[PDB]
Amino acid sequence: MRLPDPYTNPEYPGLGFESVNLVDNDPMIRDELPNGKVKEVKISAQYWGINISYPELFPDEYAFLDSRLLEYKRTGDYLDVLLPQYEAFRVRGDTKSVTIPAGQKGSQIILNTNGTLTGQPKAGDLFKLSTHPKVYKITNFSSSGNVWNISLYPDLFITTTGSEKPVFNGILFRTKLMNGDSFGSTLNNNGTYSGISLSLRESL
Amino acid sequence: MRLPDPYTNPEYPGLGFESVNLVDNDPMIRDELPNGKVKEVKISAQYWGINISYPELFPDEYAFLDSRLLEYKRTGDYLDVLLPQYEAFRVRGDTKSVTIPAGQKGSQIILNTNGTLTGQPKAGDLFKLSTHPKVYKITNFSSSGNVWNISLYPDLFITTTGSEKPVFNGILFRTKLMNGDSFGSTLNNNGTYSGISLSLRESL
Amino acid sequence: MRLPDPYTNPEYPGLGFESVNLVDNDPMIRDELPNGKVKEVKISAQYWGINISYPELFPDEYAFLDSRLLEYKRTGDYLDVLLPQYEAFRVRGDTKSVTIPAGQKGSQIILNTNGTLTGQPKAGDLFKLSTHPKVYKITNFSSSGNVWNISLYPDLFITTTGSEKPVFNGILFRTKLMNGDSFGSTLNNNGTYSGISLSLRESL
Amino acid sequence: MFYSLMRESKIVIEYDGRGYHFDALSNYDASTSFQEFKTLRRTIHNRTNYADSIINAQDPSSISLAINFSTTLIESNFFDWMGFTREGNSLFLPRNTPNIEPIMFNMYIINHNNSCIYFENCYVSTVDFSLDKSIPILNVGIESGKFSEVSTFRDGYTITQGEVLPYSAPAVYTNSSPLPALISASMSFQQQCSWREDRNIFDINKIYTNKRAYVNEMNASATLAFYYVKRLVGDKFLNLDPETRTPLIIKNKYVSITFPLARISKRLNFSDLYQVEYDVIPTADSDPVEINFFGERK
Amino acid sequence: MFYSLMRESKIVIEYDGRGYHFDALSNYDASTSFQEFKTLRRTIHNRTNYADSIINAQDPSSISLAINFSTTLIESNFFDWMGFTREGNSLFLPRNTPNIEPIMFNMYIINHNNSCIYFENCYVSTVDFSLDKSIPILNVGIESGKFSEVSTFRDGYTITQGEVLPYSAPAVYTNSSPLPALISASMSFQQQCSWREDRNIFDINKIYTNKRAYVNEMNASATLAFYYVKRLVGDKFLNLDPETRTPLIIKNKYVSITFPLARISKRLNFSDLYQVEYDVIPTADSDPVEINFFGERK
Amino acid sequence: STENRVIDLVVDENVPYGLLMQFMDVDDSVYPSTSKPVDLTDFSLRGSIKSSLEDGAETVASFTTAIVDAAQGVASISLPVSAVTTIASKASKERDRYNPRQRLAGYYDVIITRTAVGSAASSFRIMEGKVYISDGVTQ
Amino acid sequence: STENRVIDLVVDENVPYGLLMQFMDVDDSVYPSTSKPVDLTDFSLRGSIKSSLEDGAETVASFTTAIVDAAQGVASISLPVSAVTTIASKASKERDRYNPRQRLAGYYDVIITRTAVGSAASSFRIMEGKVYISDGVTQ
Amino acid sequence: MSTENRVIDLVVDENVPYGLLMQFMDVDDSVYPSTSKPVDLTDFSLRGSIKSSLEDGAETVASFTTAIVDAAQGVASISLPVSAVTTIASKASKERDRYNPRQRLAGYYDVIITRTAVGSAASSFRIMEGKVYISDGVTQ
């Protein structure tokens, strides 16, 4: 499901992140050798962590927000979020006619736009495959005409099967709440819910 | 037994809730696998936690509040707490001619209003059955004619017997006062009592 | 790989080091006998610890820095850190015609400059061999003709093979970024990124 | 239309169901205002420019009156309302504050054409007057909780201040020995109350007005200014040493503030003509401070 | 030698490669200064008396200009540079701040004999003018990062302010109903930016100058002063109650600031003639605040 | 809030005039005010433009009422270009202070009315103000 | 019309004038920047320039109107170089002391109109203000 | 910004051939920041002139010898020779600028670009205007 925000529900401008913390969580078997060399082995999967802080929420906005959150807690599905700082539409066009040749594993990826896309995805922008819900981060870009060579920080979780389509816009993190067990909201005498915050965490 | 509030007792304005804290307590066993998939397990029940804060209290206000609290601790009754922000009257009419089909044990109430109720409940409101003291929040509501499809956050604590009647307005939390083992209030030299806090828990 | 600094990238003035912290990490087993004599034992190696602090970062500065850090974490390279306060050019000339006699495994380098180098290194400067990445500090220097007697704090991590060439200027710390397991930066509502810190450790 | 002139006004204080029209009023100052909760919800989605401000409370008003002394001594009711106990025409400062909450009263500021401003839940928080070479006048300071605009009002036709008392030179005594070279005797009395804000979540979407208050302390104080005068070399009566307990009285032909035992601190200023300044407060075990109000012929 | 007179000066603002010489300047004030790091290293060895002071930064300059209204309306560029969107001759207050960093421009203060002071990296941080019974004038306030002395400069021969607009009495309306008894309408607009100090260890032994800044908020505000006037007993239109949303416009013959929806707070002063004071800010969902600039004949 | 019935109309010379009133019923009991529109049944609007308020004043023109989309509450008040010309003929030669194109043409007010919806003639004035003619250049 | 939206046109001497409008209705309640270009099919705008703002004024020039893109919403108001020369000849000579390039020529308005079968007169005024001539030397 | 945008001042230096280099570029800002492309200046002729005053009867003191150095890339150049600079300096006001004594007023100027082509779009625009000043010199 979709986390409410001013893009989906413009009538509630109180929704919307006062501050978002996009943390990098890659567990590693780090070992500090006696000779000065540091050896680290990556085994556990990496996952983005999102910490959302909300401004002063009025009673109706908080009613909508916690209604959506409680529906999340009820039906048990995943909770998608859209970070707005990465919503710079730097790539126009429709990506259905873009083919990613099969048999690709690792950080590097090669995709052929077939002369369809307009706009260059600069380093630091997000990237997501059509099938898998993992969200990557472009670290370097290099194109030779139509073919694009993109390097992603997390290695491709699944090897491309030749049908996965690039998603350069409207990327949603498939996250799970981490504050659900004890989630309280305080109501002031001024009439606003203060200090509403979420500690999300990408699942899979 | 009702907790004194400036609805029933406006002559004691210091008994108003300076700030309420509706805490969502749903203990779960959350385990994060190394493959990035976070998994949860729910066994125990969900109970609404209410925290009340008070301003400086004059001798008469404190006398009334303390007499009520000692009456509670004497008879072992259940404090009823009313939250003003949840007292918006949307559904009006008779709740006796409405029928709830029996055998509903999930997290969803299907009821035939029989055209006897005007208005429609809004998501995020408070809903409660007439035969059980547990309080529910409406997470979603779809109306197809006279039959309503109300979705509730806590899974139905009872299996409907067909005699339950929905309650939308005038809902009270059948709380039990926690932190009553060491309950006190310091009296300052200026005659006002300070440091009064009620940590209440929904003891259905 | 070089960490972005306002030498190579002056267009991003926010990437400057607001405060560096050169930490001397030489773990030792220190035991204090009751007879007042304190005794130490050294087994493990000494590694220079560098801590970098940053000011508020604009979107472009943070984009560049994050792209570089993600490139590091992708290729598993070694961040090179340049400290401006250690870039005083004293020894100038060619370091290829200078010879270092082999078999030197202590804490002292004896080298015949062969009259090819002008100036003299000062105590407390940074010194490094051309075949090893460990960085040394000159604690003492005595010159008797062309042969120099350079004394180094860390005991020589390698035994000189006779082919090493001293490096006095342009010295970089072959660091590896610690605290990268949970690395993040909060984006405030005013558009600037805050709370960015690099805890680096010299992984020779 | 109707303008509102300060000179064309009438201030009536409503206590116990009777209107105390305080004539002989030299000047009064008052203001009304509201409290706002203005927050700006700038988000990463929309860095907005328009605030979210709602008016939810009435800021307490601070009304100050300057009242001339009068022959009917209605102005002593300000000491009476501020907490002093009464015996005859003399007001005592009680050893302990009698009640937790002050004495509350309403006040009207009448004007022409049925125009009025209604201050409610008022209490007298300050009264100070300077006995000097000018006509004495006591500036009272009251704090209101709720202000309002009303059409009909209470007007004190009968209860009113008489003629102003003629000037009479002040004189300060120790027992019956006069203190020479007086400059300006200033007396100060206070009832330092505090509003108990009880704004709660039941007052959301409503305007809140302060209603109840408690007395932190009462006190009587006086600052005496003299010229540094000595009659002997190494004098004992007149010097700069502190006086732990000494009977003092700041006397006039129409008023006499008595300190049965006083704690005096002295301060010398090397000005054009040397001036000493006293700081008179009653002691710990001193008897109640007296304030006599003599209309005429004592 | 050459002295520098303020009256013999010319202020040219350099934006987009064009010089905006702002004539009709009533008065301007500016200052330049440096930041020091002065520490005294008193030790048990030597309790020294001589400090260790090094000049390492330029304190940002605060330049204030007072500019008369003109027929060519060059002064509206200050609203344009401060962040307002433009359509025709009217300036809108955008719902959200457009960019993170303000609009930067350079400014010259020319004087005779090729003397000049060059303020760089400037931004307009405040603009406020009072519509009153005197000639209106808008005081702009800009903050600089780097100041310098230069020989040749930019002089706006063509782009200049015309003749000052004749005085015209202000009037404030609600829709089209005039508000009676106006005293002084003061409007205020701000771009509350903040300098991002990025002084680092690579700037040691060098003078640092602020270069980049970000916008904390923009706002439009107005304080209206009236006389307390009532036309009826218990009037509804004119009273002291707050107004959550009401259309307001402070209109003149040459300028009209429009609040499509306004939040008004009132404050009454019991002065010689009773005065009420408004506090007008746009509401949360109000349409953009208008500022029209009419040169002549609207 | 309070009352804002007073709004001034600026009609254009040589151009027909038409105003579109979206009648509405806002209630501020709930914090997001209800957007319920009034339902236009048994409603008629009447409005005349008369120079000055004194008795016996000549009728400069008369508004032509249109009721459309009764369900959603909107309505239209208009008058033909001939009415505009008749208004502009009798307008005063003195021009408005803030706009040198407008000239005071008269006063106006429109009056809603319920005609025996409940056997009651519940007619009350909607709005009022002054009508200003704006001199054109095209014709 | 739009009394608050008066804009003064500036025409360069010795240069053909050109000004383009875009009729593009908006509805941002659903989402910001929801703007749909208005169809201008069977719309015909027209205007004029007169020396004074009153009846009996001498006409100076009439804009050569056009509809550049039908159904795209891009209309154009313009006049050829000879008309600009006539304006410069007819313009006043009270040159400002600090804007010595601009002289006042007259006042202008333009009216858009609908001429649709199955419809009626829909004339509406969209522009208003003054026409200022900017002096030129390069001819 | 009715006319404030297309007006800049030129100061021709005495005893030096004055040449100003112009670079046309179609900058797109409303749709998206930081997007600019050159204007294809083929068939986009330029012409300018200078006159002492703005009256109907004014003297043509000089005229720019405009040239399109690059047909594409939107690069053009307006320049006048040494003789024209000398004529301007001789035919200039004797009143010196107080803030810069070397500069004296010479006259006014305009620049019109005429994009005459086969397509019926023979439009003309005034892209520049302002005042012309002469900066005195001694090196001769």
Author numbering:
A (entry chain Z), B (entry chain a), C (entry chain Y): 1 to 204
D (entry chain G), E (entry chain I): 1 to 298
F (entry chain S), G (entry chain R): 2 to 140
H (entry chain Q): 1 to 140
Please, what does the article write about this entry?
In siphophage T5, the unique RBP is located at the extremity of a central fiber. FhuA, an outer membrane E. coli iron-ferrichrome transporter, is the bacterial receptor recognized by T5 (25). We present the structures of T5 tail tip, determined by cryo–electron microscopy before and after interaction with its E. coli receptor, FhuA, reconstituted into nanodisc. These structures bring out the important conformational changes undergone by T5 tail tip upon infection, which include bending of T5 central fiber on the side of the tail tip, tail anchoring to the membrane, tail tube opening, and formation of a transmembrane channel.
